[PDB]
């Protein structure tokens, strides 16, 4: 019947030069304007002739993971989802420390925020090749750091992601060249949006509680 | 006893601007001068305190693969070997078609050079994330196209690599941005050193011939 426009390219929740000098306008132009755009476009092309665009992007990822023997649309669907989650994981004037429930959970499960911080930055740095590092909440220790290769994300294992850093080379060449550790550091000191991470934790907690009831 | 310098960063067998305009001086400066350099430096740091530098790069790669559960030196040792193999896979004024025994083996195992060409370029483009695509000889069809992720190469499986293309994003951002397919096209059309590939196939056959004794 009436066609859809498929999945959309959501812009980052801030102007493309808002993350300077930590993430440049050229990076967002290239990372969002080309790579993220291309994942969405390529996904829309792959699902032409099907009703998959009726589903949420989440649902497409879950459906094409196929317990690890991934189906053709997975990489583009996962990358589309991962990149939207990425832009919303950061903000102008990010960095600093979390507060409230999120801080308490981090310190219950990692001892302290500083310990969590070093373990997250170190996982981000040691994930070889292309991929992502996540903080994630699991209901069924509630907080875990996750390393995934390429397009994979923890939704595929029923974890609720809370934070991610893109460590595909395209994510930091223009600002840090090959110095990923610097990239990872600036990310935690200047860009991470702890308010967004807390919002996502409150939602993961609600979903878990509500599953019981 | 007396110490070694560890593994050396061998320069590409041509001036750093000799691949222009297909692969820029900037690309070589970044890809050889930083990424390849960093692999060798990080490998040498990892094997301080051991006698692995008495071994060939090949031997370290095989030793650290551990039937898939790779040991700590693998990524740097495999990348170091891969990048050396890469720079010598190409040449100023490369491209064109292979001749002699190599062309005839390709046409036997792929039906034609154009078919081999299409399957190779298609494999290189469909290898998601970071990795490599290879033409390889197996003694046990004698030629095979192989996709590997991240640092893996076909030595690990007792194949003799004959040709490779680096499809890590750092291999082609500076010349093709995200346009990997165009990079692959220019590679097979302008850079591949079929003469070198033929030389490698000679040795591979000799190694298999001598293996009969
Ligand atoms: Zn990305
Ligand atoms: Zn490389």
Numbering used by the authors:
A (entry chain A), B (entry chain B): 1 to 140, 157 to 229
Published text:
The PEP complex is composed of a prokaryotic-type core of four plastid-encoded subunits and 12 nuclear-encoded PEP-associated proteins (PAPs). PAP7 belongs to methyltransferases, PAP10 is a thioredoxin (TrxZ) while PAP4 (FSD3) and PAP9 (FSD2) are both iron superoxide dismutases (FeSOD).
The C-terminal domain (Gly94–Gln229) displays an α/β fold with a three anti-parallel β-strands sandwiched by four α-helices and the N-terminal domain. The catalytic center is at the interface of the N- and C-terminal domains.
